[PDB]
Amino acid sequence: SGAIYVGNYRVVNRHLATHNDWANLVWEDSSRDLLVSSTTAQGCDTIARCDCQTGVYYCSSRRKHYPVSFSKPSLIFVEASEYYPARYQSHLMLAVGHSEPGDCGGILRCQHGVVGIVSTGGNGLVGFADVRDLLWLDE
C-alpha cells in the first residue's frame, strides 16, 4: 500500500484504488496501473522532473529503504493477475531489488523528489510506475 499527495491530487496504484478514489476520479490508465483522485486537504510531495536512473525506494516487506539503479520508463510484459490479464504495462522502470505484492505503493525518490511508485515485482526485480511525465500534477 501507499500513495503520493501533491496539491489537490492523490496518486495510487489503479489496482488498489478505493470507492472514494473512483468517486473523485481525475484520471486513470490501466496500461500504467495508475489512478489519480482529488483531495480536500493539500499535498506537499515534490514530483521529480528529470531522467535520473538512481534513487531510493521504500520496501514495506522489509520495513527498509533500499538504494537502486533503474531502467528508463518503457513497455514491459506483465504476467496475468487477479486485477489484469497478461499485457504490456507502459511507463514502467525495473530495478534489481526485493519486492512482494503488498509492497505496491512504496515511493521511489531521487534527489529531485518523487519518481514513481512500486507497481510490479518478483524474481529479485522490482518495477515502478513512473509519474515524472505527468506535468499537470503541479499546475
Ligand X SMILES: COc1c(C#N)cccc1CC(=O)N1CCC[C@H](C(N)=O)C1
Determine whether the annotation assigns residue 110 to a binding site.
yes
Sole binder of ligand X in the list 95, 121, 130, 132 (CB under 6 A):
121
Which residues would be at the binding site for Zn ion (CB under 5 A)? Answer: 48, 50, 52, 110, 112
Based on the shown chain and the rule CB under 6 A, indicate whether residue 130 belongs to the binding site for ligand X. Answer: no
Show the cell assigned to 78. 506483465
Q: Which residue is nearest to Zn ion (CB)?
A: 52
44 a catalytic residue: no
Question: Is there binding between residue 100 and ligand X (CB under 6 A)?
Answer: yes
All residues at 6 or more sequence positions from 102 whose CB lies less than 8 Å from its CB, including other chains: 1, 60, 61
19 is catalytic: no
DSSP state of 46: P
Instruction: Evaluate whether 61 touches 106 at the Cβ level (below 8 Å).
Output: no
Q: Name 106's Cβ contacts closer than 8 Å, sequence gap at least 6.
A: 2, 57, 58, 59, 60, 99, 117, 118
The residues that are catalytic are 15, 33, 104
Contact footprint for ligand X (CB under 6 A): 15, 33, 78, 81, 83-84, 89, 99-101, 103-104, 119-122
